[PDB]
Each structure stands twice: as structure tokens, then as C-alpha cells.
Amino acid sequence: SEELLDLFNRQVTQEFTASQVYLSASIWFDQNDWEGMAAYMLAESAEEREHGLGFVDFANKRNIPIELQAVPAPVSCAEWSSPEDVWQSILELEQANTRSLLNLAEAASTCHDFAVMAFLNPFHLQQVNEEDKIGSILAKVTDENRTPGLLRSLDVVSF
Amino acid sequence: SEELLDLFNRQVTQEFTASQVYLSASIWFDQNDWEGMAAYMLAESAEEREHGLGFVDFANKRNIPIELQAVPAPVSCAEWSSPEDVWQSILELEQANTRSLLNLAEAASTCHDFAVMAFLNPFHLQQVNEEDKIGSILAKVTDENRTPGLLRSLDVVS
Amino acid sequence: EELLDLFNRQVTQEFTASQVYLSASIWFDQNDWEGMAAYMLAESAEEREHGLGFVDFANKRNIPIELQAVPAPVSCAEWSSPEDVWQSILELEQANTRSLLNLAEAASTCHDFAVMAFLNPFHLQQVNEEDKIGSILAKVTDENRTPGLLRSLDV
Amino acid sequence: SEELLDLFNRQVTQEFTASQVYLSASIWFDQNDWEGMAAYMLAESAEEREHGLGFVDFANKRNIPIELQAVPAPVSCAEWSSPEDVWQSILELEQANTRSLLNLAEAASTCHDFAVMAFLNPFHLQQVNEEDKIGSILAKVTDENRTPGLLRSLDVVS
Amino acid sequence: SEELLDLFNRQVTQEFTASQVYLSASIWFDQNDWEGMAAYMLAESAEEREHGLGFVDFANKRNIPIELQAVPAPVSCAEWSSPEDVWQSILELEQANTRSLLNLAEAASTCHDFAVMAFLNPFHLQQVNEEDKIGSILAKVTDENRTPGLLRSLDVV
Amino acid sequence: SEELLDLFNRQVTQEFTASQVYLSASIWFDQNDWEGMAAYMLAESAEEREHGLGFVDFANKRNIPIELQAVPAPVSCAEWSSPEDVWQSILELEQANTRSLLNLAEAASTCHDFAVMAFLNPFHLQQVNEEDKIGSILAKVTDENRTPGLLRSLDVVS
Ligand SMILES: [Zn+2]
Ligand SMILES: [Zn+2]
Ligand SMILES: [Zn+2]
Ligand SMILES: [Zn+2]
Ligand SMILES: [Zn+2]
Ligand SMILES: [Zn+2]
Ligand SMILES: [Zn+2]
Ligand SMILES: [Zn+2]
Ligand SMILES: [Zn+2]
Ligand SMILES: [Zn+2]
Ligand SMILES: [Zn+2]
Ligand SMILES: [Zn+2]
Ligand SMILES: [Zn+2]
Ligand SMILES: [Zn+2]
Ligand SMILES: [Zn+2]
Ligand SMILES: [Zn+2]
Ligand SMILES: [Zn+2]
Ligand SMILES: [Zn+2]
Ligand SMILES: [Zn+2]
Ligand SMILES: [Zn+2]
Ligand SMILES: [Zn+2]
């Protein structure tokens, strides 16, 4: 059925888009001397690409034809002015990855596609851990940034 | 030297664009049961991604501002009907990557940007190896494909 | 020949920079920034190795070297905080980058491909050092906004 | 003496001429994307040069004056249009290296030069092994080349 | 251009010519019982051949057509009489090959051939180290040969 | 007090001055193809700089203000024309540095500065060893330089 095929392709695009947006965050961090937060975003960019590639591989195995779409330019970088803005956009990015996965799971449930649902399970649990972790980092950032220089003092350690 | 900063940015785009094209080739091979050619392309896709990241890292160190551009949808895949069409497209892709590196070096030379020229030196030599390698694979593919089934034999001898 | 002049001058620049890093190490130590002082001391040794590297290449290439005086560092009398020191160190490295580029430009006019090849790893090294220094100065300047917080990070 | 000193010098030229012909073959193979055959010819070029050096070293010990001659430009490479042509020329090169050693041994025998004859023994036996190996490769080449693409699938293997 | 391709092809001939001239030096040293110097020249003959093979390999990768030329017979050897004569010819051989590399780089530079320039960099630096090493052996040889027999000491390396 | 703190400050200049003059000797030897003597001088150059840095470190610890002075250009190198000239200058350099440490210890002695005197003890014993070592190399050099070529054939050994 075509909607499942459509949503499956859209997931690939969403993971590669997340990959670029994480890469954009690394660059912002780096240009602004937050080497540790830049390292973390770089590692996450590589991880989102791996998610994308796992969907491509599953799709190839299951005969779901994939046609790669444009990966848009990240644009939030234009307006980030502190680490708190960057981490807030990364949280929103991950909340969007979770919504597209839940959409995909909903369509497969409708279609009684037990294999796609089994395939998605570890991704549902990984988004739980990912949102939890970003939420935690954002809480620390917005707390420590209430004292000048304190946040920097902790890029240096943690990350 | 706005020209240099522009060519440096576009170089990131070209490496990430090549990564996507290699990924599209890996998908087309996979869908047509060329698993060995698919893993080869998938490896090259990750490697093009690493090149781009290496440009980004250098640009960050040298205060060359990077803004990531869209990576366009690959479109050669619509038209491939055999492994030879894919490998031909990958050859032309690398020849465009080579051209683009050489343009960027020309711009660096003109600016006397010696750091940029030194940074590019190993990429120039890498392109020489990459085109040679593809050229040789395309020669073998084009020869073996003259007998039905024989090319299939050598996907597996990989 | 401007190329020989400049090559012999690069030796002096490296040893000059070695002494400026040693001066920074002294100011840090005297003001109880041991971490920062350790760091400048290791960079002082490193500049000296760059100078020895130019002397060795020149000897091999028959570029006559005559050692000049190594000028006294002048910036230390003015430094009042770690920000002043790291700022002067950034300028010192910028000056050295400029001087390696002018050397490479003379070598390029003369078609001296060997000297150009010899300089390549130095050009790339300067890019990494200016980046590292810029990044440390950024942290210093941010952390110094809260009394005593910078100390937390030397240590 | 005379005849023996001249032939011993000529043998040095012959080994190094052979080294260069093998190198010409490696280049032709490489330019036409036969990497495995190319590697084999490169490995043989180095080994011919070693034979050459072995003669020089023996001559030096036995006070035979060596004057190094021009090593001629390889010319068969102008004519090669497939792998079979290259292997054929290599087989004929080795049959002439064999002739040259046998002629040397002949002059040594006449002069009753037992040390020279002892020195050449392993080379005569090595020529037997070389002509046999090349004959056998040329047989396989000319058999595989009867199906388009098949030869290529076996540069890749062997 | 014609020129850059002619020069690359010739550079192979240059490295193989240097290989034979080092072989000719080893032979002269061996015939004159300078075993240590003979072994040095023999190892340098192999290395020049490796340089030539390095150019051939690059040329194949880069589609620069190579046709091997004759490697001329070594000439200096007929007139060497003492180790100083040999070392001086070897220095001159190395100086010539440095000029031949700089001329190739210049041709590559005119054509904006960045790949050939990059490929050449380690060879330019290698020449600097070779000329230096030979110049220094030659200074020692011409100093020790002032006392009869003493230079036999350099040889027992 | 003033005189002691000044002499301590200027001991740093004397060590760094000695470092540069060793470096200059290493350059003269290298330029004249005495690589063995050049390596020896280079290593002593690094050692004189470590002695300087030992003074700086102790001064930092004992709150003796250090103001780094110009390190003078070495000038003996303009008149050196044989290895014996270089080694004789190096000997005078070390005798000068010994006198310079003894004066420092004498000022510390008048000041009852037991810490400085303890700090200096191993430097005094090091100067003894260095003078003896250089005296000994100089005697060998002067003796061997009586026969042309002979000194050369001992840079090579050592
Ligand atoms: Zn960075
Ligand atoms: Zn993650
Ligand atoms: Zn994901
Ligand atoms: Zn994610
Ligand atoms: Zn598959
Ligand atoms: Zn690759
Ligand atoms: Zn690339
Ligand atoms: Zn590529
Ligand atoms: Zn201290
Ligand atoms: Zn430096
Ligand atoms: Zn530096
Ligand atoms: Zn090849
Ligand atoms: Zn063989
Ligand atoms: Zn042979
Ligand atoms: Zn043979
Ligand atoms: Zn011998
Ligand atoms: Zn060479
Ligand atoms: Zn050479
Ligand atoms: Zn030297
Ligand atoms: Zn000392
Ligand atoms: Zn001393």
C-alpha cells in the first residue's frame, strides 16, 4: 500500500535531515568555541545517518522502493545566538523524529504490517532515551547559563 | 577572496552530494541483487561523507564560515538500467569532484593561500587514485558484461 | 637575496616566539596559574623545535644561517590578567603565520619548490595553533566574567 | 677468455633488457586495467634485475671486467593489442634469455671454466621453471580469451 | 601540454639512468676493493629504480602515457681513478636530477597541474637530503684522502 | 636583596647565551660536514637551555623576579676556521659560565642565602664535569688535527 511506502521514504529523509541539523549544531558550537558540545553534535549527526541507512537497508530487504529526496539546508543556525537556542532546536528536532516514527508505526498497524512494527520497536525505545537525554542536557544548560562563564566551565568538563 | 570562501563552501556541498549519489548507487545495486557492488558503493558513500566533514573541520579552524546547503535529490538512478550505467555515472561523479577540487586550488593559488593549498594536496592525490580505481572497475564491468551472467560471477568474487 | 634573508629571519622569529611563550609561563607561574604556566612552557619548547627545524633544513640546502640576537619579550610588563597574556600569545601566533606566508611567497616567486614543500606542514600547523589559542582565549574571556571562576579551570 | 668475457658482459645486458621488457609489459597491462597481470610482470622485472646483479657480482669476484651497456628501449609493446600478445612476447623473451645462458655455458665448457659452469647451473634450472610457468599462463590466457570477458574474470582471480 | 607529458616520461628515464650510474659506481668500487662504498652505491641504485617505478605508477594512474626509453650506458666510469672522482660524479648526477625534478614541477605549475605538484613534493625534499648526504661524504673523502691509506678507514664503514 | 636577585636574573641570560653559542657551533660543524661534532653541540645547546629553565623555575618558586633579557647574537662563529677554534671557544664559554655560577654562589654566601647555595651545588659539580669533558675533546682534536684527514676519521667514530 502506498501510504506506508510514502511514510517509509519520508522517514529516510527525516533521519538524514536530522543528521544535517546535528552537523549544523556542531559547526555553530565549533565556531563559537564549545568544542565538547560540538563533538557531541558531530557524533549524533553520524548516528542519525546510521538510522537513515538502517531504514534504507530494511526497505531494500522488504521490497519497499526508496527514492532518495533532497536533504534541505538547516536554517536555525542563522538565528542561534547561545548554546541554549541550539539545544532547544535539537530537542524540537528529536520530538519531530519521534512523531514521524509514531506516524510510520500507526500506518503499519493499520496495514497489519507486523514486520515493520517489529522493525520499529527499537527505534521507539531509542527516541525515548534520546528525548530524555536532550531534555536533561537542556535543563543543565539553562541552569548553568544563569551565571556568566559557568556554562563554559562545564563544556570543558562534561562532553 | 569571497570567491575562495564560496568555493570552499561549495566543496562541502559537492562531497555531501557525492555521498548521496553513492548511496543511490548502493540502493540501485541492492534492488537488483548486486550485493557486492552495493557494499562497495555504501563504503564510498561514508568515505565521501568523511571528506566533507574534513573540509568542514578545516574551514572551522581557519574561520572560513560554512553554511550547509541542501543536498539535492540524486537523479541518475531514474535512468540506470545496468551495472555499467551506474559505474559510468560514478566515474563522471568523481571526475566532477576532481574538477571542483582543482578549481578550489586555483582560487587558493591566486590568493596565495598556502595553507589551503597544503590542505588540498592529499585530496588531489586521493582523486587520482579514485578515478583510476573506478576506471579500472568500469573496464572490467564493460568487458565481463559481454557474456550473459558472467558479470554476476564477479560481484560474488567481491 | 630576499629568500635567504627571510629564511634566516624565520629562525629568529621562531626563537623570539619561544622566549615570548617562556615569558607568558613566568607571568602565569608568578601569579599562580600552574596549568597555564605548564602549557606556555611546552609551547616555548615547541617554538624552539620549529626554529631548529628551519636551521636543519637551511644547513641541508646550503642556505647560510647566521644566528641573530633573540630579542627580549616586551609584553609581560603590561599583562594584568590571563586574558592579556592569551591575547598577546594569539597576536604572536598571527605574526608568525604572516611571516611563514611571506616566506612561502618569496619561495613561490623564486620557483623554490623544495622550500614550498618544506613549509607546508608549518602552514597547517599554524592554522591548528591559531584555532587552539582562539578557542582558549574565548573560554578565558567568558569565565573571567565571574570572580574566581577562571581559577576553577586552570586547576 | 676473450669470447667468455664478452659473453659474460652481454648476459648482464640481456638480464637488464629482460627487466625492462617485463616493465613494458606491466605498463601495458596496467594501462588496460589488467592489475593482476601487471603486478606479475612488475615482480618479474625486479627478479630479472636481480639476475643481472648476480652476474655482475660474480664477474666482480672472478675479475671479469664488466662495462655496463645501454639497456635498449622495449619495442614489442608497440604491437600488443591483447593480453595474449604480451604473454607471447614474454615467452619469446625467456626463450632468448635461455639461449643466451646456454651459449654462455658453451663458451665456459670450451674454456674448461668449471667455476663459471657451476655458477650458471641454478640459472639453467630456473630458466626451465620460468619457460614452463609462462607456457602454462599463455595456454590459460589463450583458452580463456575465447569467451568475451572470461579472461577478465581471471586477472581478478589469479 | 606536450611539454608536461614529455617531461614526465623523461623523468622516468632520468631515474633509471641514475640507477645505472650508481650501479656503475658500485662496480668501480668493488673492482678497486672499496666494499663499503660499493654496497652504499648498490643500495642507492635500487632506490633510484624505486623512484623511477614511482613515476611510472603515478603516470599509469593519471593516464600520462609512458613509453620506456633506452637507459644509456654510464659514461663517467671510464675515467674514474680514485674514490673522490666517483663521489664527485655522483654529486653531479644528483644535482642534475634535482634540476630535472624542478623543471618538471615548473611545467606542472604553468599548467596548474596540482596533482603532479603534490606528487612531486616528497621527491623535492628527498633530493635536498640526498645532495646534502653526498656533499658531506665527498667532503670527508676529499679530507681523508690527503693521507695515504687513511681513506680505507671510511670504507670499513 | 638587590645584587643577588640581579645576578640570579642574569644567570638565566648566561645559560641561554651559552645555548645559542652551542647552537652556533653546531651550525658551523654542520656547514663544514662534521655531523658528529654538530650533533654533540646541538645536544649541549638543549642542555644549556634546560639549565636556564631550572634557574627560572627556582626563581619563580623563591619569588626572585625574572625579567628575560635579549639573548646576544653568537659572534665567535665569524672567526672559526677549524674544529679546534670552535672547541676552544666552547671551552672558554664553559669556563665563563663556571665563573658566573661561582660569583652567584659568593653573593648568596654573603647573604646567608642557604637555599640558593644548596640549589647551586649540583651546577658547580656539573661545571667541573663539563670543563673536563671539553678539555679532553679539545686535546684529542688538537692532537689528531696534526695529520691531514685524521680528525675526520674520528668525528665518524666518536
Ligand atoms: Zn574546531
Ligand atoms: Zn543519540
Ligand atoms: Zn534517528
Ligand atoms: Zn535522533
Ligand atoms: Zn540487501
Ligand atoms: Zn574511495
Ligand atoms: Zn570526496
Ligand atoms: Zn570521491
Ligand atoms: Zn611554580
Ligand atoms: Zn613556530
Ligand atoms: Zn607557534
Ligand atoms: Zn594501476
Ligand atoms: Zn620468475
Ligand atoms: Zn633472467
Ligand atoms: Zn627470466
Ligand atoms: Zn665484491
Ligand atoms: Zn631519484
Ligand atoms: Zn637520487
Ligand atoms: Zn647536516
Ligand atoms: Zn649551563
Ligand atoms: Zn654548560
Side-chain angles (χ1 to χ4, degrees):
Chain A
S1 181
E2 75 173 287
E3 196 225 14
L4 190 40
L5 145 68
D6 176 66
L7 286 185
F8 214 100
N9 282 269
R10 285 194 185 275
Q11 197 56 38
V12 170
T13 306
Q14 176 65 22
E15 302 294 344
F16 290 157
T17 305
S19 181
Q20 298 286 91
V21 169
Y22 273 109
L23 177 65
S24 85
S26 188
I27 288 165
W28 190 93
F29 278 138
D30 218 82
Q31 292 171 331
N32 288 281
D33 308 297
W34 295 95
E35 276 84 8
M37 291 179 191
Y40 174 102
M41 290 304 178
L42 192 71
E44 280 298 317
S45 174
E47 181 202 297
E48 297 301 335
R49 167 165 201 277
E50 297 299 324
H51 298 163
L53 297 174
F55 275 80
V56 169
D57 175 62
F58 185 82
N60 292 349
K61 294 186 301 193
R62 238 294 291 278
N63 308 113
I64 291 179
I66 289 297
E67 181 183 291
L68 295 172
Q69 299 302 142
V71 192
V75 288
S76 301
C77 40
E79 293 294 337
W80 291 336
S81 41
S82 73
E84 175 182 353
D85 297 339
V86 183
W87 289 98
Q88 176 63 41
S89 304
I90 288 315
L91 177 57
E92 290 167 22
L93 174 72
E94 292 288 356
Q95 288 170 162
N97 292 174
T98 300
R99 272 186 322 269
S100 69
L101 287 165
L102 294 180
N103 281 354
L104 182 51
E106 200 82 81
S109 185
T110 292
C111 265
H112 294 284
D113 198 327
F114 297 103
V116 170
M117 285 180 297
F119 174 73
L120 300 178
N121 293 157
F123 292 89
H124 292 132
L125 292 177
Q126 142 109 74
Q127 289 306 116
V128 174
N129 294 343
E130 198 71 39
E131 291 191 34
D132 174 62
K133 168 172 73 159
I134 302 315
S136 186
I137 299 168
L138 179 66
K140 301 177 201 340
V141 169
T142 183
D143 203 8
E144 295 178 28
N145 84 7
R146 293 158 74 210
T147 293
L150 185 59
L151 188 57
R152 192 66 90 156
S153 239
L154 296 274
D155 175 78
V156 162
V157 210
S158 202
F159 299 111
Chain B
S1 99
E2 70 222 15
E3 190 207 11
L4 181 60
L5 315 164
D6 205 67
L7 285 187
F8 207 107
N9 262 276
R10 113 76 170 254
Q11 187 62 29
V12 171
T13 305
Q14 181 64 20
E15 310 290 340
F16 288 164
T17 293
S19 184
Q20 281 292 78
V21 178
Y22 273 109
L23 176 58
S24 169
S26 176
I27 287 172
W28 186 91
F29 286 127
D30 223 288
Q31 284 170 344
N32 296 282
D33 303 302
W34 298 89
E35 278 86 21
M37 297 183 192
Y40 178 98
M41 292 307 176
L42 188 67
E44 278 302 318
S45 174
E47 171 189 313
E48 292 301 339
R49 188 164 179 278
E50 290 311 313
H51 293 166
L53 287 175
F55 278 74
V56 167
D57 180 40
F58 183 89
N60 285 346
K61 295 180 328 188
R62 244 286 300 273
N63 315 117
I64 287 173
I66 283 307
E67 77 164 42
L68 293 174
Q69 314 188 100
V71 186
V75 65
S76 300
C77 182
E79 303 302 303
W80 293 327
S81 33
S82 69
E84 189 182 345
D85 294 337
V86 187
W87 285 105
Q88 179 59 42
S89 288
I90 289 302
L91 181 64
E92 288 165 16
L93 176 71
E94 293 283 358
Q95 297 166 339
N97 284 357
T98 298
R99 168 43 95 99
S100 184
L101 284 163
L102 290 171
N103 286 346
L104 171 63
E106 191 61 64
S109 192
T110 286
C111 290
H112 299 290
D113 196 321
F114 293 105
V116 166
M117 289 185 284
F119 172 72
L120 293 182
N121 285 339
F123 294 90
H124 301 305
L125 296 181
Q126 162 96 126
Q127 291 304 114
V128 167
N129 296 335
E130 193 73 53
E131 291 193 26
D132 176 66
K133 180 177 65 170
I134 295 155
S136 168
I137 291 162
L138 176 69
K140 301 169 168 50
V141 167
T142 298
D143 209 347
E144 291 185 26
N145 87 9
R146 296 184 197 155
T147 292
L150 182 68
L151 183 63
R152 200 60 95 153
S153 287
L154 297 278
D155 179 70
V156 335
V157 149
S158 264
Chain C
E1 172 100 317
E2 81 158 343
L3 174 64
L4 153 65
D5 185 68
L6 288 185
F7 205 103
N8 187 83
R9 187 183 171 274
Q10 192 57 37
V11 174
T12 306
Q13 293 314 298
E14 299 304 334
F15 289 161
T16 299
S18 182
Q19 286 290 87
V20 178
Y21 274 114
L22 178 58
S23 182
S25 184
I26 288 157
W27 185 93
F28 278 134
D29 214 71
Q30 285 174 343
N31 288 276
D32 301 302
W33 299 91
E34 285 79 20
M36 290 178 196
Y39 175 108
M40 295 298 182
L41 184 65
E43 281 293 320
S44 176
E46 180 189 296
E47 303 293 341
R48 177 149 185 289
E49 286 302 325
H50 291 165
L52 294 177
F54 279 79
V55 166
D56 183 50
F57 178 88
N59 286 350
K60 287 157 161 184
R61 244 291 294 282
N62 312 118
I63 291 168
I65 288 305
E66 301 212 304
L67 297 176
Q68 301 311 95
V70 194
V74 316
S75 281
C76 174
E78 299 144 43
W79 291 338
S80 297
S81 66
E83 191 179 349
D84 292 338
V85 189
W86 281 100
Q87 169 75 29
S88 295
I89 287 304
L90 180 65
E91 290 169 36
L92 172 67
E93 282 304 348
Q94 295 175 335
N96 203 34
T97 295
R98 284 186 310 270
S99 147
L100 287 160
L101 293 171
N102 291 345
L103 179 53
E105 186 71 72
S108 184
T109 300
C110 285
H111 307 283
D112 199 319
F113 298 97
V115 166
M116 284 179 294
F118 172 68
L119 294 176
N120 286 339
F122 296 90
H123 299 304
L124 288 184
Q125 165 66 201
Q126 281 310 102
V127 165
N128 291 345
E129 290 262 32
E130 286 187 36
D131 177 67
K132 173 162 53 73
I133 300 160
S135 166
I136 289 155
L137 178 65
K139 305 161 175 36
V140 166
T141 297
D142 200 4
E143 296 180 30
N144 81 9
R145 295 157 72 221
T146 290
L149 181 66
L150 186 58
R151 220 27 117 162
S152 287
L153 290 84
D154 178 77
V155 88
Chain D
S1 206
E2 167 78 27
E3 165 102 76
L4 187 62
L5 151 52
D6 289 321
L7 286 179
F8 204 108
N9 264 277
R10 289 214 270 274
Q11 191 54 33
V12 171
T13 305
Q14 177 67 37
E15 304 295 340
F16 290 163
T17 295
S19 176
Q20 292 288 95
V21 175
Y22 273 105
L23 182 59
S24 183
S26 178
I27 285 152
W28 186 92
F29 282 130
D30 219 86
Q31 295 171 338
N32 292 278
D33 309 296
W34 296 93
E35 289 81 19
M37 283 176 196
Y40 177 99
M41 298 299 182
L42 192 70
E44 287 293 322
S45 177
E47 164 190 317
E48 297 296 340
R49 179 164 184 273
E50 293 305 322
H51 297 166
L53 292 170
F55 278 77
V56 163
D57 180 46
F58 186 83
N60 286 350
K61 286 178 200 166
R62 236 296 289 280
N63 305 115
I64 294 160
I66 290 297
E67 198 176 307
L68 290 179
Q69 302 288 293
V71 188
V75 296
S76 292
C77 49
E79 253 38 46
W80 291 336
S81 57
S82 68
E84 173 175 359
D85 294 334
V86 189
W87 291 101
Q88 180 63 38
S89 293
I90 291 313
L91 180 61
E92 302 172 13
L93 184 70
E94 290 284 359
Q95 292 168 338
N97 286 342
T98 296
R99 273 185 261 111
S100 188
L101 288 166
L102 288 167
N103 284 357
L104 181 58
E106 202 80 77
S109 195
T110 292
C111 282
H112 288 293
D113 197 320
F114 295 102
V116 168
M117 284 187 283
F119 174 67
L120 298 175
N121 287 156
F123 287 91
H124 290 128
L125 291 178
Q126 162 79 16
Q127 284 310 105
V128 171
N129 291 347
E130 294 195 25
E131 289 193 25
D132 179 64
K133 184 175 86 222
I134 290 154
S136 158
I137 292 163
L138 170 67
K140 305 166 195 352
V141 169
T142 68
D143 200 10
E144 299 182 338
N145 77 3
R146 295 155 65 219
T147 294
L150 185 54
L151 191 57
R152 187 68 89 163
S153 62
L154 295 278
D155 183 74
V156 177
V157 154
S158 324
Chain E
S1 68
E2 174 66 346
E3 209 220 358
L4 167 75
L5 317 178
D6 293 334
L7 286 178
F8 208 101
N9 190 254
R10 162 181 177 300
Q11 183 61 213
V12 170
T13 307
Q14 266 290 114
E15 300 290 348
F16 292 160
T17 295
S19 183
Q20 287 290 98
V21 167
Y22 272 114
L23 180 61
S24 78
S26 88
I27 287 163
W28 187 99
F29 281 136
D30 245 297
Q31 295 168 343
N32 292 281
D33 299 302
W34 295 93
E35 250 76 38
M37 292 175 198
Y40 177 94
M41 293 304 182
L42 191 66
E44 285 294 317
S45 174
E47 162 191 310
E48 294 301 338
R49 172 168 198 273
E50 296 301 320
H51 299 168
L53 296 178
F55 281 76
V56 163
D57 184 34
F58 186 78
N60 289 350
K61 291 186 303 196
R62 242 288 299 274
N63 311 121
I64 287 160
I66 283 309
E67 291 209 325
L68 293 177
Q69 312 183 304
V71 205
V75 186
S76 291
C77 45
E79 302 292 350
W80 294 334
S81 57
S82 65
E84 181 178 337
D85 294 341
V86 187
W87 286 100
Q88 179 59 48
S89 300
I90 290 308
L91 178 70
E92 290 170 14
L93 176 80
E94 293 283 8
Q95 280 164 353
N97 197 226
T98 295
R99 282 181 310 270
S100 78
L101 294 161
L102 287 176
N103 277 174
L104 177 55
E106 180 75 62
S109 174
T110 301
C111 293
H112 300 302
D113 195 330
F114 293 106
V116 169
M117 297 193 280
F119 173 71
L120 302 175
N121 288 155
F123 290 91
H124 295 128
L125 296 174
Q126 165 76 12
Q127 280 314 103
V128 167
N129 290 341
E130 284 283 17
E131 289 190 35
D132 176 65
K133 169 154 61 88
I134 291 156
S136 171
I137 293 174
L138 176 71
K140 290 179 196 7
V141 164
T142 138
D143 193 19
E144 293 183 23
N145 77 6
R146 287 155 39 151
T147 289
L150 181 56
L151 178 69
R152 292 287 171 187
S153 93
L154 195 69
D155 197 69
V156 284
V157 228
Chain F
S1 115
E2 43 265 287
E3 186 225 357
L4 176 62
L5 304 211
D6 285 353
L7 275 198
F8 201 104
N9 186 73
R10 96 103 213 255
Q11 193 57 36
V12 172
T13 311
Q14 171 92 151
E15 300 294 338
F16 290 162
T17 294
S19 182
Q20 289 289 100
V21 172
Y22 276 105
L23 179 57
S24 177
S26 177
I27 292 166
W28 187 92
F29 277 134
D30 211 270
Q31 285 171 338
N32 286 287
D33 305 293
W34 295 95
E35 285 87 5
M37 288 173 193
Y40 172 102
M41 292 307 175
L42 189 69
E44 290 306 296
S45 179
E47 175 191 305
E48 292 305 329
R49 193 186 162 258
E50 291 303 319
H51 294 163
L53 295 171
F55 277 79
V56 168
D57 181 41
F58 180 83
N60 284 351
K61 292 186 302 187
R62 236 284 301 273
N63 316 105
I64 292 179
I66 283 312
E67 156 143 30
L68 289 179
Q69 309 174 313
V71 181
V75 288
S76 302
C77 187
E79 52 80 10
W80 287 335
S81 62
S82 64
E84 171 187 356
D85 289 333
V86 185
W87 285 101
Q88 170 72 41
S89 296
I90 289 303
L91 184 51
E92 302 169 7
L93 175 81
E94 291 293 354
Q95 296 161 341
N97 203 35
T98 296
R99 279 182 322 261
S100 184
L101 292 165
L102 295 178
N103 293 345
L104 180 60
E106 187 81 74
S109 195
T110 305
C111 281
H112 291 295
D113 199 321
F114 295 105
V116 171
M117 282 180 287
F119 173 69
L120 265 6
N121 283 339
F123 293 92
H124 302 307
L125 296 175
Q126 216 272 338
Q127 286 306 110
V128 170
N129 295 335
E130 282 282 13
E131 285 191 36
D132 171 62
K133 175 161 53 69
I134 289 152
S136 173
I137 288 159
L138 182 60
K140 300 184 207 326
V141 161
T142 62
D143 200 8
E144 288 175 31
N145 79 6
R146 293 157 66 242
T147 288
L150 183 60
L151 177 69
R152 202 62 94 155
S153 62
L154 285 294
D155 177 79
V156 181
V157 187
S158 221

